[PDB]
From a paper:
Single residue mutations in the antioxidant enzyme superoxide dismutase 1 (SOD1) are reported in familial ALS (fALS) patients throughout the world. The native structure of SOD1 is a homodimer of 32kDa size. The intramolecular disulfide bond and Cu-Zn metal coordination impart higher structural stability and keep the dimer intact. The SOD1 mutants in ALS have a toxic-gain of function by destabilizing the functional SOD1 homodimer, consequently inducing fibril-like aggregation with a cytotoxic non-native trimer intermediate.
PB is a linear unsaturated fatty acid chain designated as (S, 2E, 4E)-4, 6-dimethyldeca-2, 4-dienoic acid. Intriguingly, in the present crystal of the SOD1-PB complex refined to 1.90Å resolution, the PB ligands bind to SOD1 at two new binding sites: close to the dimer interface and the lateral region, which is close to the electrostatic loop. The crystal belongs to the hexagonal space group, P6322, with five SOD1 dimers in the asymmetric unit. Four PB ligand molecules are bound to the SOD1 proteins in the asymmetric unit. The ligand-binding site at the dimer interface is formed by the C-term part of the β1 strand, a loop connecting β1 & β2 strands, the β8-strand and the N-term part of the Zn-loop in chains C and D. The compound is wedged between the K9 and Q15 side chains of the chain D and D11-P13 residues of chain C’. The ligand is supported by hydrophobic interactions from the carbon side chain of K9 of chain D and P13 of chain C’. The PB ligand is bound at the lateral site region of three SOD1 chains in the asymmetric unit (chains B, C, and I). On superposition of three ligands onto each other, it is revealed that PB anchors to the binding site through ionic interactions with the residues N86 (chain C and I) and the backbone carbonyl group at D124 residue (chain B). The aliphatic part of the ligands contributes to hydrophobic interactions with L42, A123, and L126.
Residue numbers in the entry:
A (entry chain B), B (entry chain A): 0 to 153
The structure:
Amino acid sequence: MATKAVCVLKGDGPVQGIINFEQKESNGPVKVWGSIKGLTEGLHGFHVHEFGDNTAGCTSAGPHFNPLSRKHGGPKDEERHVGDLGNVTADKDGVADVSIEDSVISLSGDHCIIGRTLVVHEKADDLGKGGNEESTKTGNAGSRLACGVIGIAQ
Amino acid sequence: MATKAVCVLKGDGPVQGIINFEQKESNGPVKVWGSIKGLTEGLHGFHVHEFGDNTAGCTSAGPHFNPLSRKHGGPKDEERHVGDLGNVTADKDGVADVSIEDSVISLSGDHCIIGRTLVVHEKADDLGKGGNEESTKTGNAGSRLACGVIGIAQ
Ligand SMILES: CCCC[C@H](C)/C=C(C)/C=C/C(=O)O
Ligand SMILES: [Zn+2]
Ligand SMILES: [Zn+2]
């Protein structure tokens, strides 16, 4: 019944932010928006990972949320992880003003992302086009800069 | 659905801990265990609040999770909030070795607490027996010392 969710991103370094999720219809897309600061200018992978487990920091969130056991892709690919939201772009001040609409993640059902972990990564997601085994798993997006558990919101 | 959940508790002060949840059968009880350190010796209210919203620290989690619109009570009362897990006891070293079993919360379905916020409070929960308005809402457990969003665990 959740139509709204929210996530506070934190990590070891300066990266932090707040990301909102809104889904007016359970059969409709999820709007994803907010601000992340402290990033290097440019593209950063932006993924929902499987577990809402931050006991060992972002490492314990596990791999990309992939209940259909597909290969990694970009959000517009048919072959993609449910958690594959592509990249977000930080401006010259280090601020990513996130604005994504996605119809594969959901706030309910099998693809529900509530209770899982949103992660913003060190470098660009290659969207599965990197030609190596890592590309088909993580997009070569590198280390986890900040994360948080996605929670139900008012 | 989920059989395991986990929660990392943090706050403005020194209180921190890790709480695990286990529900081997979807229609059976939830086991809740772990360790919270940095507490004053004695009883501390221990509740699931409605929203997994940490944007204002523990404040934005809202009231106790109460989908059945009941009055506050202790875990063994029939008249209780779903989020009413009672008290946890911190020893002389400031450590609460939590061990709770509850049949009202769940890790799936309508009483699902995944994506909501676990909070440990400053004072004892009076279990609804304090004789004022506050008693039947929060148990007079006082301020929110630490909290975290409850996430799906491996
Ligand atoms: C190992 C460094 C590769 C970085 C390359 C110059 C750009 C990439 C991968 C971005 C791709 C994209 O736009 O998705
Ligand atoms: Zn992926
Ligand atoms: Zn209550």
